[PDB]
Design a binder for this molecule. Structure first.
Ligand SMILES: CC(=O)SCCNC(=O)CCNC(=O)[C@H](O)C(C)(C)COP(=O)(O)OP(=O)(O)OC[C@H]1O[C@@H](n2cnc3c(N)ncnc32)[C@H](O)[C@@H]1OP(=O)(O)O
Ligand SMILES: CC(=O)SCCNC(=O)CCNC(=O)[C@H](O)C(C)(C)COP(=O)(O)OP(=O)(O)OC[C@H]1O[C@@H](n2cnc3c(N)ncnc32)[C@H](O)[C@@H]1OP(=O)(O)O
Lengths: 39, 149, 38, 151
């Protein structure tokens, strides 16, 4: 144990924990949908 | 083949807008601009390209949930409508896409916790269920979508 | 705006405080039926 | 043939004839497994051939922390080891052990609040086994992977 992280190791890790939370696949499809004005 | 959503202005032509739900069509024509100016509700419209004729719209409004604990803020997706000329062409899901992403950005800046929907018909309810909204089992035709954080 | 009764409020708060969903790959791993419960 | 449900490594388990393909893991099991089990340094779970105490596969969970030297502590679970005996390769046992290991880390997270599983991959074929099952590859350290745990 007791692994020691530099500033960007620690930051990468913190960003993985606090990362944009996932959602249900139907909701994920809705967010991924490319609308008829985005060509 | 339709323009990107833009905030409702007085220059948008909404007089000949027909969705199939007259309550929504009447709100747009008679209360859209007033609420835009009051800030009570924010309406976004899509137009036929190279025109200002409204093909579809939705309205976002701020609300709060209280217990009969300080109130919990939510976004109300008050309205979403497509003109009958554009029904079943995937525009309704394109507007819901835009509406939900917009509510994600609002959540990041003021911390609203969920999108709330009060469906008028039970067919409207199933439009939202089909796109990942959760149906309240303690209230009729009320749906929720949790927002990040 | 909205007044919720105790059951309405509870359903809502349980939706907010509900566990975060998992990555679809990770969800498959958690759902896996392993070769020892055969 | 058939294999037993995971159980904690005990003195009754036969580990002398265990060969994974990675010698460092096989040596740790035979020479350090029981001692660390008793000390509580790392905690090893084994699957055996049914009606037997011969180890077909195992993994080790250990508690660790992510630190900055002002005050920045954070507990994590270390998946220190995961190995299948070459006799049991391509029977889906490696993914069955990873399934068990991750569910176990979910239950640990519910009770002590560890934030993530950390994995230090030795071979780069092992790295891609974890990526294939949802683990995220660190870009600031080579062969280090993470899985966020609930809460
Ligand atoms: C009351 C409120 O707060 S908002 C209520 C919703 N609005 C209304 O009821 C107003 C009148 N209705 C309308 O304006 C429209 O018919 C809407 C909003 C219901 C949908 O508009 P449409 O243009 O028909 O939708 P669109 O073509 O984008 O539909 C795309 C997808 O939704 C599905 N869908 C559309 N309406 C429904 C419905 N009522 N139930 C289930 N699925 C539906 C389509 O089948 C399609 O699914 P798929 O892509 O998986 O095959
Ligand atoms: C110290 C540490 O960091 S522990 C990690 C390092 N471990 C080792 O090096 C030990 C030596 N190797 C082994 O014991 C094994 O070969 C392992 C653990 C790497 C893989 O376990 P196996 O039992 O061989 O794999 P299994 O048959 O269960 O494979 C299941 C899945 O893994 C995938 N997989 C297996 N090996 C690999 C690989 N090298 N790269 C990518 N995916 C892989 C398969 O495609 C399969 O996916 P699928 O079910 O969707 O088709």
């Amino acid at each position: 144990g007791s692994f020691n992280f530099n500033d960007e190791q620690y930051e990468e890790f913190i960003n993985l924990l606090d990362a944009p939370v996932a959602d249900d696949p139907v909701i994920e499809k809705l967010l991924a949908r490319k609308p008829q004005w985005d060509v | 083949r339709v323009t990107a959503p833009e905030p409702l202005s007085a220059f948008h032509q909404v007089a000949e807008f027909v969705s199939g739900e007259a309550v929504l069509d009447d709100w747009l024509k008679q209360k859209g601009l007033k609420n835009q100016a009051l800030g009570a509700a924010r309406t976004f419209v899509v137009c036929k390209k190279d025109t200002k004729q409204v093909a579809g719209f939705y309205s976002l409004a701020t609300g709060s949930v209280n217990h009969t604990p300080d109130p919990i803020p939510v976004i109300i997706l008050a309205r979403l409508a497509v003109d009958l000329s554009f029904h079943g062409k995937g525009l309704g899901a394109d507007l819901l896409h835009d509406a939900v992403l917009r509510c994600y950005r609002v959540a990041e800046n003021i911390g609203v916790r969920a999108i709330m929907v009060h469906a008028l018909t039970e067919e409207a309810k199933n439009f939202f269920i089909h796109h990942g909204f959760k149906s309240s089992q303690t209230q009729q035709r009320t749906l929720f979508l949790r927002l990040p954080q």
